[PDB]
Design a protein around this ligand. Structure first.
Ligand SMILES: CC(C)(O)c1cc2nn(-c3ccc(CO)cc3)cc2cc1NC(=O)c1cccc(C(F)(F)F)n1
Length: 291
């Protein structure tokens, strides 16, 4: 069970969902999929308040289902590598999800050094990869398919502990769906065709591992290749090496563990869902990767 907040409480803790960035004293931290996330203090606990809004091609019912799912998942799924729902507001205006704040925000934001945060060390990236995989493993152990494993949804605590976030699109447990959801640039071919399988999360995690290795977002429209997972094809076709795409904003990246992680990334990014490692193998390979 979580604390049921009034929308006003969350309005109050988020300084009336202050749209100004946290970086300039405001409360807006990120415009996540299907909602804006606001820094807040409930008592002395820094919280992430995800205010859910219609945004892009979301119905109220689907948004409420994703809220209900987030809470449903977050109820079942407490793990050091899953974000922690403290509670929610359904009372007024927008639906709100209150989480234990993640001081280091998204892996995406940290990989991009958004707001001038220092580049993640390879060491921290390995921990993040490991943690994220431990998060995904826990979700899969608990027969939850995240269905939107992406750097944006891997949040980073005070310790850069990977916290898998956003279980709105999470699914219990292969089955198919008419409502194909997830982030294109992270989605397995089968996820993009509406297959719902944990194997898709592995693929999406593979893209994350490429993001971690490369510091490149899964998609950059102003980049060639636009899709990071293409660099896997460029590396497999020996057009490029992993060291060509390896994030230059690291000094502590050793070829062995980066190749080890790329090897996990590659295996995760097997276009054949069944030839991908299950998250347990991904875990083992990411543990093996740090000696
Ligand atoms: C992910 C998000 C919203 O983009 C986010 C961005 C952040 N940026 N910074 C930040 C950036 C730069 C500096 C300068 O060093 C300091 C802090 C902290 C952040 C924290 C965030 N999320 C959470 O705290 C959080 C926790 C659980 C569930 C959720 C969710 F709503 F996503 F489900 N969010």
């Amino acid at each position: 069970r979580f604390h049921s907040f009034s929308f006003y409480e969350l309005k109050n803790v988020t300084n009336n969902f202050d749209e100004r960035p946290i970086s300039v004293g405001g409360n807006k931290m990120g415009e996540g999929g299907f909602g804006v996330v606001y820094k807040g203090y409930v008592n002395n606990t820094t919280v992430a308040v995800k205010k859910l809004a219609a945004m892009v091609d979301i119905t109220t019912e689907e948004l409420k289902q994703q809220f209900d799912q987030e809470i449903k998942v977050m109820a079942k799924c407490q793990h050091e590598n899953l974000v922690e729902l403290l509670g929610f507001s359904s009372d007024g205006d927008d639906l709100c999800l209150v989480y234990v704040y993640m001081p280091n925000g998204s892996l995406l934001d940290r990989l991009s050094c958004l707001d001038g945060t220092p580049p993640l060390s390879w060491h921290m990236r390995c921990k993040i990869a490991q943690g994220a995989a431990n998060g995904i493993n826990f979700l899969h152990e608990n027969h939850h398919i995240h269905r939107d494993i992406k750097s944006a949804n891997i949040l980073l605590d005070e310790a850069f502990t990977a916290k898998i976030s956003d279980f709105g699109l999470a699914r219990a447990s292969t089955v198919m769906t008419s409502r194909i959801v997830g982030t294109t640039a992270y989605m397995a071919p089968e996820a993009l065709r509406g297959e719902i399988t944990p194997k898709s999360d592995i693929y999406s995690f593979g893209v994350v591992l490429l993001e971690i290795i490369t510091g490149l977002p899964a998609v950059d429209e102003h980049r060639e290749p636009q899709l990071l997972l293409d660099i896997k094809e460029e590396i497999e076709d020996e057009e490029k090496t992993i060291e060509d795409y390896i994030d230059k904003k690291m000094n502590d990246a050793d070829s062995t563990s980066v190749e080890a992680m790329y090897s996990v990334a590659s295996q995760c990014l097997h276009e054949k869902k069944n030839k991908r490692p299950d998250i347990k193998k991904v875990q083992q390979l990411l543990q093996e990767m740090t000696a």
